[PDB]
Amino acid sequence: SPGIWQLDCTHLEGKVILVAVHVASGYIEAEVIPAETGQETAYFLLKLAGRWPVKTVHTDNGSNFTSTTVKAACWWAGIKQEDGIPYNPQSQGVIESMNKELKKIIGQVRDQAEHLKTAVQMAVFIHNHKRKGYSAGERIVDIIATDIQ
Amino acid sequence: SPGIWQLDCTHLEGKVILVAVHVASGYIEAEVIPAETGQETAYFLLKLAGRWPVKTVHTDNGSNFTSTTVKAACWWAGIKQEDGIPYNPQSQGVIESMNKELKKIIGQVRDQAEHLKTAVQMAVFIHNHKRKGYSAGERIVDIIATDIQ
Ligand SMILES: C=CCN(Cc1ccccc1C(=O)NCC1CCCCC1)Cc1ccc2c(c1C(=O)O)OC[C@H](CCC(=O)O)O2
Numbered sequence A, B: 001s002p003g004i005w006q007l008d009c010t011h012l013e014g015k016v017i018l019v020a021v022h023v024a025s026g027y028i029e030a031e032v033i034p035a036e037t038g039q040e041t042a043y044f045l046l047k048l049a050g051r052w053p054v055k056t057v058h059t060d061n062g063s064n065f066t067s068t069t070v071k072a073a074c075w076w077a078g079i080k081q082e083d084g085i086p087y088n089p090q091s092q093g094v095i096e097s098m099n100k101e102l103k104k105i106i107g108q109v110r111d112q113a114e115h116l117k118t119a120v121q122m123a124v125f126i127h128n129h130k131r132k133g134y135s136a137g138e139r140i141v142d143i144i145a146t147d148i149q
């Protein structure tokens, strides 16, 4: 549970926002990319896993599941690459809601930056700091520290 | 001290590696950029502060200290922007040693990637996971979790 992340891909302004969610806390990392390729996905995972103790990644689609580049990054970084099949139906619902919330935040900050990637990082910041009482940022840290002890 | 970060800029292959160090743990984030500008620095800070609770940043030079774009990012993200004067002489030494260790790791992985940015992320991963017995990644999480509590 402390090591489980879910990948998520959403679209805005003709671009792709690649998101990783720490399932147990709702904490996110995200980046803007021109298109979701194996290489972009692989590079994003490598960044993520150098930053948090990533044990398991549920990939966002079959192409990223299949991709040899993605498997090579998961190999490199010690990540168990898994499918994203929503055996629990509440999963699709949580991600859809997260995408809608993120796009809403992006629209609130959109005039505060020329480039979408700036607005996306502003959105990541607001999302992770939002007290819902703890924030997602507080929850990930507490979950992982408890696991270390 | 759980909220205090230090910026550090180093060079390799005609490129700039921008590093943020969490002072109390030695945990790092890093990126490759064509040149250190106020905009690049500002964007890097915005990313960092959406991901960790960044209270204070000691800027790496006077130009980033002066930069209105950097001050605008620190304002946006709730960061106290401070100078990086090593009133403690051990600080210079700690940073120089980190740069040399990072470059050593980069050379150890350099052949496993075509692009420098990939090798730098592999170096970030190895650095943060290295036990010295706790890793820097374990220390940052424990330090912050204690603080939240
Ligand atoms: C100084 C000019 C830059 N912008 C002026 C601006 C333009 C339009 C609206 C508001 C503002 C504004 O001042 N907002 C306040 C503000 C300032 C700093 C941080 C957060 C908020 C903002 C900005 C900074 C760094 C970036 C950006 C952008 C962008 O406009 O998107 O874009 C990606 C770029 C990528 C890295 C690289 O390529 O260097 O880093």
Ligand SMILES: C=CCN(Cc1ccccc1C(=O)NCC1CCCCC1)Cc1ccc2c(c1C(=O)O)OC[C@H](CCC(=O)O)O2
Pocket (backbone or CB within 6 Å): A037, A039, A040, A042, A043, A046, A069, A072, A073, A076, B111, B112, B113, B114, B115, B116, B117, B118, B119
């Ligand atoms: C399939 C070709 C890609 N490379 C082949 C390669 C080339 C030379 C040596 C070894 C390997 C190799 O397969 N190493 C194993 C390996 C280790 C860790 C992760 C993946 C693979 C590796 C790579 C992947 C993603 C990237 C990269 C790079 C790069 O070569 O630097 O560069 C930046 C790019 C940025 C995102 C974007 O722009 O798409 O993401």
